[PDB]
Short mmCIF file of N, CA and C (backbone and C1' of nucleotides) and ligand atoms in Angstrom, two decimals:
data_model
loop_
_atom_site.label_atom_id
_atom_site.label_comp_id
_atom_site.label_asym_id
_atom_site.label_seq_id
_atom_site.Cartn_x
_atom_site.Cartn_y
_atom_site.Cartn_z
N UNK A 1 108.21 84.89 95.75
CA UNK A 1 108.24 86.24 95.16
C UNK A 1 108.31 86.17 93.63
N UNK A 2 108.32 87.19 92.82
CA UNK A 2 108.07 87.32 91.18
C UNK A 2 108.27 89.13 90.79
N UNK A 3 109.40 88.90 90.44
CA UNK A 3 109.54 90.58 90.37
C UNK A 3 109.17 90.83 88.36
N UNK A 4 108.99 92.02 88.22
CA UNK A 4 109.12 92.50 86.92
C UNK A 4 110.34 93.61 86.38
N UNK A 5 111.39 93.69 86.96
CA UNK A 5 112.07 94.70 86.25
C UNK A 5 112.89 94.20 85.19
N UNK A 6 113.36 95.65 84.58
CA UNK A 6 113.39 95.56 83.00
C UNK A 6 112.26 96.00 82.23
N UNK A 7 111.32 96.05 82.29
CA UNK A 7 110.55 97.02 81.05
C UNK A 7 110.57 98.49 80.96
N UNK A 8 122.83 95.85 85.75
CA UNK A 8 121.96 95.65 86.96
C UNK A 8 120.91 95.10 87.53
N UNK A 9 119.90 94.85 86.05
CA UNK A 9 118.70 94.34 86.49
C UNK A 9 118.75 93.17 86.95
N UNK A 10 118.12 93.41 88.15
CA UNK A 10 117.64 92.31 89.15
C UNK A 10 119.41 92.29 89.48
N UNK A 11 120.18 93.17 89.56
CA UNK A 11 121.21 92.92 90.02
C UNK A 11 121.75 94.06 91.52
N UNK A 12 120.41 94.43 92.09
CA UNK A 12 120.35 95.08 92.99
C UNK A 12 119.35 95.07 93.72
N UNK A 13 119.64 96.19 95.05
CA UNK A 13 119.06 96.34 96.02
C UNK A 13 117.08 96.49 95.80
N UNK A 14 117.04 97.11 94.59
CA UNK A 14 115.71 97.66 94.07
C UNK A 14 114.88 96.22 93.37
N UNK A 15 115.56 95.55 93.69
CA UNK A 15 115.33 93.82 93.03
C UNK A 15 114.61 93.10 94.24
N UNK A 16 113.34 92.58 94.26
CA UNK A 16 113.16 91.75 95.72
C UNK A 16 113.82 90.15 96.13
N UNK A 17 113.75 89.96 94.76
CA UNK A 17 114.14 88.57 94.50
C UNK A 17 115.99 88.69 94.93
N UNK A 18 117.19 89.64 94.66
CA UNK A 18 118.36 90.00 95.03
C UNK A 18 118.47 90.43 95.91
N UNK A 19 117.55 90.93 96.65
CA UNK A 19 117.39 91.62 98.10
C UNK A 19 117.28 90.64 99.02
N UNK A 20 116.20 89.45 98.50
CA UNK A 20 116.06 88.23 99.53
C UNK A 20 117.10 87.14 99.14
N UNK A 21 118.37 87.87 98.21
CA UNK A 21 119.16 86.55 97.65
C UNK A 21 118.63 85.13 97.52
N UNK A 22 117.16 85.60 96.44
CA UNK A 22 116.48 84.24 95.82
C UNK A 22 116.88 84.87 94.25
N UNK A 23 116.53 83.58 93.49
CA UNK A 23 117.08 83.62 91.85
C UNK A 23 115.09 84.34 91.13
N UNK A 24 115.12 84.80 90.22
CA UNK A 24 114.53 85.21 89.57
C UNK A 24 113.52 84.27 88.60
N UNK A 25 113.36 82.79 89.26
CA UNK A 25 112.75 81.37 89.01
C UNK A 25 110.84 81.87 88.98
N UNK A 26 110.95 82.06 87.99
CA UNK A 26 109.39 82.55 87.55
C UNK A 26 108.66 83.93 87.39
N UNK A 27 110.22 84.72 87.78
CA UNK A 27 109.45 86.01 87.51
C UNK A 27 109.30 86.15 85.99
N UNK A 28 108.52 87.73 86.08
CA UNK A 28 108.41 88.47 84.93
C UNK A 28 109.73 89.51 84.75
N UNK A 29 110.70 89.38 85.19
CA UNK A 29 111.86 90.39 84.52
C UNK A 29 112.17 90.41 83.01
N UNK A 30 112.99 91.23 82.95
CA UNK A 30 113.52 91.13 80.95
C UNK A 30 114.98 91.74 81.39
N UNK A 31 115.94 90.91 80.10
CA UNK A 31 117.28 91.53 80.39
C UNK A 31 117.68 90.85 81.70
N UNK A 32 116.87 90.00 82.79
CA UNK A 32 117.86 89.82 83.89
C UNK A 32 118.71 89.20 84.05
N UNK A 33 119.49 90.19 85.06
CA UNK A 33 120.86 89.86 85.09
C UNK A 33 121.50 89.24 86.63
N UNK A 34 120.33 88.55 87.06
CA UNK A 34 120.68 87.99 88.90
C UNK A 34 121.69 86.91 88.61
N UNK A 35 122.67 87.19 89.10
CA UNK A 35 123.61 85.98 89.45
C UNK A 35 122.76 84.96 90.19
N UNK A 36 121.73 85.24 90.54
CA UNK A 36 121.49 83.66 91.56
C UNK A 36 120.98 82.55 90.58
N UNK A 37 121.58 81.04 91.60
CA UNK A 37 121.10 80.50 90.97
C UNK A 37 120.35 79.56 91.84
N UNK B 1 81.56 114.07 81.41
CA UNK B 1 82.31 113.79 82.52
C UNK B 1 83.15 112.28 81.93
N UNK B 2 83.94 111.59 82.45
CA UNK B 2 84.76 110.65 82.09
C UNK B 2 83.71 109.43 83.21
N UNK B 3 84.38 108.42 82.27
CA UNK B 3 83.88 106.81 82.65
C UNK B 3 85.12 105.99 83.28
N UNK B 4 84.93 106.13 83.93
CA UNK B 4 86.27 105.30 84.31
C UNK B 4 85.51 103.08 84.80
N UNK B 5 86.54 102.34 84.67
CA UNK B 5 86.16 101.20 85.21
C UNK B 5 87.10 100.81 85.93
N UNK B 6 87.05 101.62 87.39
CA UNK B 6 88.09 101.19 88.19
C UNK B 6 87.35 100.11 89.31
N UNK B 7 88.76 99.09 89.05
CA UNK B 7 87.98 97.65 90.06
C UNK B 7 87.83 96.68 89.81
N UNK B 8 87.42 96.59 88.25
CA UNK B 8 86.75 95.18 87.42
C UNK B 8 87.26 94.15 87.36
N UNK B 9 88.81 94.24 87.76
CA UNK B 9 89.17 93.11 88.15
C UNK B 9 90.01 92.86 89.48
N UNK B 10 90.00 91.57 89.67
CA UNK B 10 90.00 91.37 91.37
C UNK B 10 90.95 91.68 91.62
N UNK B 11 91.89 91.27 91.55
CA UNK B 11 93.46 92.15 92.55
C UNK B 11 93.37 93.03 92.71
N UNK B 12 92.91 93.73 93.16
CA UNK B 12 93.37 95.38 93.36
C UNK B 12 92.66 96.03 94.90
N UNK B 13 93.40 96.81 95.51
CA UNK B 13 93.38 97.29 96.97
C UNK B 13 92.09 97.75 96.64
N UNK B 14 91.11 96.90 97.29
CA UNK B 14 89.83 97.71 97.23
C UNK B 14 89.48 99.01 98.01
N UNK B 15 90.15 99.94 98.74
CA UNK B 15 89.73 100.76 99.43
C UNK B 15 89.96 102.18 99.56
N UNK B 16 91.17 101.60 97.51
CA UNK B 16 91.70 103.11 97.38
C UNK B 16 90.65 103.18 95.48
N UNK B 17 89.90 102.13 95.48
CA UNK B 17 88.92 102.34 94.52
C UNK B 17 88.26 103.66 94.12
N UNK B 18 88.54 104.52 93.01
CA UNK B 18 87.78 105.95 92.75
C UNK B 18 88.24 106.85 93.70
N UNK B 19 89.39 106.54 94.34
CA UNK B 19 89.75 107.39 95.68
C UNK B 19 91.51 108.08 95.25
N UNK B 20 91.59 107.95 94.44
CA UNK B 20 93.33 108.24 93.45
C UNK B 20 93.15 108.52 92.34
N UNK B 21 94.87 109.10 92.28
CA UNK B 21 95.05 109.96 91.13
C UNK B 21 94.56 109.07 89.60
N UNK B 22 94.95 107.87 89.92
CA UNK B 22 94.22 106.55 88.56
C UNK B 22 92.98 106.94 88.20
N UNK B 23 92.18 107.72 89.09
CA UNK B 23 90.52 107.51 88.80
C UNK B 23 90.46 109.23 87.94
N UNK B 24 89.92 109.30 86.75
CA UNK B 24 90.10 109.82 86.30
C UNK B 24 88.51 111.33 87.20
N UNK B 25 87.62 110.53 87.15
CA UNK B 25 86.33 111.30 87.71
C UNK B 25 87.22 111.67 89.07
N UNK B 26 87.71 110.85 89.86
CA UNK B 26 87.98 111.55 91.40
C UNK B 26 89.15 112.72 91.32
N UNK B 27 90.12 112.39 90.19
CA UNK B 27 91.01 113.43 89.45
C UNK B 27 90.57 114.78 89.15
N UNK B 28 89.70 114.29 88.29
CA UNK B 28 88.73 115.92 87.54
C UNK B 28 87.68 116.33 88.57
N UNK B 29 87.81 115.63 90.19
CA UNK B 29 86.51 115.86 90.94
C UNK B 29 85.15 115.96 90.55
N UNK B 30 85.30 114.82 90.08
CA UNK B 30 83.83 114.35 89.41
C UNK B 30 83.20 113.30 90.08
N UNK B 31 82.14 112.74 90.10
CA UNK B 31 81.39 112.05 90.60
C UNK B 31 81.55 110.48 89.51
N UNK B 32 81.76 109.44 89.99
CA UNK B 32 81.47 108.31 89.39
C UNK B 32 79.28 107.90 88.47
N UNK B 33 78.79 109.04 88.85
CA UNK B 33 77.55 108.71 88.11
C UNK B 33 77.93 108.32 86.77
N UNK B 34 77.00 107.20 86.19
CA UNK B 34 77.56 106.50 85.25
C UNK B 34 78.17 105.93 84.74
N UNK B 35 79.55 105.86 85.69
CA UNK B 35 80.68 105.22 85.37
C UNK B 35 80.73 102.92 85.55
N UNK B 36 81.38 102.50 85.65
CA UNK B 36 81.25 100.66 85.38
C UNK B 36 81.77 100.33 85.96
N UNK B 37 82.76 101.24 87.55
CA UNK B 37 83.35 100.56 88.28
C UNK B 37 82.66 100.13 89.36
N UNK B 38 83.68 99.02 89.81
CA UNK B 38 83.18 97.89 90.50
C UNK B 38 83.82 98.53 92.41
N UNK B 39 82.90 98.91 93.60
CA UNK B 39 83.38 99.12 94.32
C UNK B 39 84.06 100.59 94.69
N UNK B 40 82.88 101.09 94.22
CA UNK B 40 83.63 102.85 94.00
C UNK B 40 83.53 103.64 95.28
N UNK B 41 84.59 103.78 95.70
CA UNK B 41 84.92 104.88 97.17
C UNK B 41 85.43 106.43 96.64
N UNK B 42 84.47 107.08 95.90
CA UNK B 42 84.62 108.25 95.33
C UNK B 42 83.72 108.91 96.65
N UNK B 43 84.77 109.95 97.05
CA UNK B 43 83.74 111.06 98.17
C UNK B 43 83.30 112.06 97.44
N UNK B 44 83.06 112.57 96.30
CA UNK B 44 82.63 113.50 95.44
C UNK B 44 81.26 112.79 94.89
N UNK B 45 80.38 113.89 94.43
CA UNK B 45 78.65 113.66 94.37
C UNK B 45 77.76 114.37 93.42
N UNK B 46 78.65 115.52 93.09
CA UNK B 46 77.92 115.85 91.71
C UNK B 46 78.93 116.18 90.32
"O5'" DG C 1 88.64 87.28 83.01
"C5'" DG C 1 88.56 86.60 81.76
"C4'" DG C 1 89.89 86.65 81.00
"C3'" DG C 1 91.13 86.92 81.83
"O3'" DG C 1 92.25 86.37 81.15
"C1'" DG C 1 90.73 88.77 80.41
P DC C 2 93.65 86.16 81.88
"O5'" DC C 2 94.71 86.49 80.74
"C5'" DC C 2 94.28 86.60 79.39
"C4'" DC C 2 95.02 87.72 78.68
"C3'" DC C 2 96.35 88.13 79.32
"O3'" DC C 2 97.32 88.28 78.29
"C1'" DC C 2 95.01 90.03 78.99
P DG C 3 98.87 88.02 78.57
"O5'" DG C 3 99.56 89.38 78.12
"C5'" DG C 3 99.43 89.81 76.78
"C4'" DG C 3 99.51 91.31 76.68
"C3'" DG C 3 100.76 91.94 77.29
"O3'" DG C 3 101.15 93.03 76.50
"C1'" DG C 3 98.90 92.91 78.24
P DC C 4 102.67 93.23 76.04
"O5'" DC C 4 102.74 94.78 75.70
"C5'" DC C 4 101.70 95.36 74.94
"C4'" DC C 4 101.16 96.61 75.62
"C3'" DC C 4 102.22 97.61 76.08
"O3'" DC C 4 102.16 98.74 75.27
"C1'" DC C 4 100.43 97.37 77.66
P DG C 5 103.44 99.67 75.11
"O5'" DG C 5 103.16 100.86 76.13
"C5'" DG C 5 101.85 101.40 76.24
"C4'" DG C 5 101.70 102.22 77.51
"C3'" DG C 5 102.96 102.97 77.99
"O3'" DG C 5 102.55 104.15 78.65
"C1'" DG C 5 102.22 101.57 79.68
P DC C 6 103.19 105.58 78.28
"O5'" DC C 6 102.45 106.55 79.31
"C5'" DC C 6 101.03 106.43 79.51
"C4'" DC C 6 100.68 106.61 80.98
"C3'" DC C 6 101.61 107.56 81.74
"O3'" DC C 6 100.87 108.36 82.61
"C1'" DC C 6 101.57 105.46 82.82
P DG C 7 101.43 109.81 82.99
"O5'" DG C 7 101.05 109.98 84.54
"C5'" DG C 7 100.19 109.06 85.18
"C4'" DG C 7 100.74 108.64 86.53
"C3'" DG C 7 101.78 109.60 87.13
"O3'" DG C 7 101.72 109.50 88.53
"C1'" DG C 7 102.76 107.51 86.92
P DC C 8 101.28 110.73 89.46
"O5'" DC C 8 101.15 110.02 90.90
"C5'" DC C 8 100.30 108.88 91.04
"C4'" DC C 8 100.87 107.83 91.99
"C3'" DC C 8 101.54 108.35 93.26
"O3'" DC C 8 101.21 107.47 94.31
"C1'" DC C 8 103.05 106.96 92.11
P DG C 9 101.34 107.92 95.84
"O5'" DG C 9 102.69 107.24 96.34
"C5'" DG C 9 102.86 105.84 96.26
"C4'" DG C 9 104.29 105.47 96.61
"C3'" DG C 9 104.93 106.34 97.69
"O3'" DG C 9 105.73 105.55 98.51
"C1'" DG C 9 106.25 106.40 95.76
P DC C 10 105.73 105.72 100.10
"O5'" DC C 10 106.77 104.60 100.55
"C5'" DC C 10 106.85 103.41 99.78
"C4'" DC C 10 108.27 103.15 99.33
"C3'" DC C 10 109.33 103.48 100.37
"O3'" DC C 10 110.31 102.51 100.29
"C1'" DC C 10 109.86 104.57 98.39
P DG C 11 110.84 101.77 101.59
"O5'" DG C 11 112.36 101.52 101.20
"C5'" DG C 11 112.65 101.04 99.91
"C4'" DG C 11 113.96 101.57 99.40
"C3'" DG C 11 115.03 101.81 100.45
"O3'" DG C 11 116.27 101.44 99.91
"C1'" DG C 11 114.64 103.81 99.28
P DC C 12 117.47 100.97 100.85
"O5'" DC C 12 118.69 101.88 100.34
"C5'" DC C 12 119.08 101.83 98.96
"C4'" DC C 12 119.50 103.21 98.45
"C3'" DC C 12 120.59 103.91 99.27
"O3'" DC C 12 121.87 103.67 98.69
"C1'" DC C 12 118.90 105.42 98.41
"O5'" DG D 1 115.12 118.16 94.87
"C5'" DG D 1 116.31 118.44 94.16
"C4'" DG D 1 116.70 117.27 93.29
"C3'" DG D 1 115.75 116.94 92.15
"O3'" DG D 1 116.51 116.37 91.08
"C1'" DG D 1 115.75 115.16 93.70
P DC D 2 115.84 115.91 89.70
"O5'" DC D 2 116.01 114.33 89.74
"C5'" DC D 2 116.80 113.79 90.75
"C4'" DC D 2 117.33 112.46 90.37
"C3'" DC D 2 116.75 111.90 89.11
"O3'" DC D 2 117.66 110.96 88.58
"C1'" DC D 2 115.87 110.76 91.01
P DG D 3 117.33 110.17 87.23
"O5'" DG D 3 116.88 108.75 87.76
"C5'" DG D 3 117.67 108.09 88.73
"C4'" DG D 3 117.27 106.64 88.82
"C3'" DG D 3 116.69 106.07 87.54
"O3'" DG D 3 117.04 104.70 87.44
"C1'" DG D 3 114.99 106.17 89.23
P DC D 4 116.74 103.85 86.11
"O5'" DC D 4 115.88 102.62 86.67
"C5'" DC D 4 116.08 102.17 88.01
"C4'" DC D 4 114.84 101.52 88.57
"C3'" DC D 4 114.02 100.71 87.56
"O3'" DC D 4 113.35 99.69 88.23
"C1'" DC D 4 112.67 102.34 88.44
P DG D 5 113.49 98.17 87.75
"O5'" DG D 5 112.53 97.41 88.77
"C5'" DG D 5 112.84 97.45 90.15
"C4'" DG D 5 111.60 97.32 91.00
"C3'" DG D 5 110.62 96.24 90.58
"O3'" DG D 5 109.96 95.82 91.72
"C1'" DG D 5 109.58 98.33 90.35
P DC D 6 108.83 94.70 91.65
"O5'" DC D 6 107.49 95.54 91.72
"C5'" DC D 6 107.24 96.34 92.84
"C4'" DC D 6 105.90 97.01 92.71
"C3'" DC D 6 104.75 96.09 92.28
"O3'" DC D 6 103.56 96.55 92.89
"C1'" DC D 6 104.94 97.81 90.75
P DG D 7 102.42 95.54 93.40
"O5'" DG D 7 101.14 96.50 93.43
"C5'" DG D 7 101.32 97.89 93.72
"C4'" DG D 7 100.12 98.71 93.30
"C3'" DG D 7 98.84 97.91 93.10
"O3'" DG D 7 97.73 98.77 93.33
"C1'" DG D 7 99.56 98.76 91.02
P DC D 8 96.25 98.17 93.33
"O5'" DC D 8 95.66 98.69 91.94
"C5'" DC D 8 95.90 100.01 91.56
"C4'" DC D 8 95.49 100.26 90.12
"C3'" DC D 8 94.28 99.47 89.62
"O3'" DC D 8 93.57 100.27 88.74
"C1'" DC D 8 96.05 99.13 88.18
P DG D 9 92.01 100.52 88.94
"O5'" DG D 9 91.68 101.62 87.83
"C5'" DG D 9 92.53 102.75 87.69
"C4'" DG D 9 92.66 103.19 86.23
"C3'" DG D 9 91.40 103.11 85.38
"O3'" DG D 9 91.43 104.18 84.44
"C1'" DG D 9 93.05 101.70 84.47
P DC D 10 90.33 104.30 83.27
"O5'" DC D 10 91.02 103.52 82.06
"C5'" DC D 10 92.34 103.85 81.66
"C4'" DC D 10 92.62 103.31 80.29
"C3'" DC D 10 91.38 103.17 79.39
"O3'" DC D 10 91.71 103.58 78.04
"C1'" DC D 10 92.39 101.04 79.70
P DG D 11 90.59 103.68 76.88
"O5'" DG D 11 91.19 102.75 75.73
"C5'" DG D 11 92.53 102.95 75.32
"C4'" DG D 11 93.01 101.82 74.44
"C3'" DG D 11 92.07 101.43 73.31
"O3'" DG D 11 92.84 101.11 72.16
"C1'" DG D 11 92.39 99.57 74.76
P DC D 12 92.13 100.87 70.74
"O5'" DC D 12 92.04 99.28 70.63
"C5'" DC D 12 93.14 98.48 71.00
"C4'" DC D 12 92.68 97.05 71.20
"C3'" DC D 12 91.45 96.67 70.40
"O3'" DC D 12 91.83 96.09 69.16
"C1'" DC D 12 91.43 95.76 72.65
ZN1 LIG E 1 114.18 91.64 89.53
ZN1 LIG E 2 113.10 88.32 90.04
ZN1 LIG E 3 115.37 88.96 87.16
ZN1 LIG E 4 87.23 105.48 89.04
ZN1 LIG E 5 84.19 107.07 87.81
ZN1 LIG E 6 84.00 104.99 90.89
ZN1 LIG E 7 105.71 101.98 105.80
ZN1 LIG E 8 106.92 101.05 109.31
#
DNA sequence: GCGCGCGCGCGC
DNA sequence: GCGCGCGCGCGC
């Protein structure tokens, strides 16, 4: 997966990458804020 | 009438092509004559 | 072809 | 009824 938000972030339900409790490892977000690692 | 180039590039759901609010001719119920898109499913004709 | 940004639409 | 991630037309 590869989400873009930000243009909480990625620190919720509306996040796919936090939804599938995967880390944000190549998306396009800005500002994110996923605890995963 | 407006030009739209909806399509030109590949990703995109080909089957809502000229068929949505994005398409500016299928918007204004216009006909794609003349227009540069690639794959146009516009049901409008003149 | 790429990136910007608009606005659709779903999930709450 | 709202909010924002995402699909894609458009300027360049
Ligand atoms: Zn995210
Ligand atoms: Zn992500
Ligand atoms: Zn993120
Ligand atoms: Zn069109
Ligand atoms: Zn057209
Ligand atoms: Zn068309
Ligand atoms: Zn469904
Ligand atoms: Zn279903």
């Amino acid at each position: 997966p590869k989400c873009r938000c930000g243009i909480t972030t990625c620190r919720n339900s509306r996040c796919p990458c936090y939804k599938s409790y995967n880390s944000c490892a190549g998306c396009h977000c800005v500002g994110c804020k996923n605890p995963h690692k």
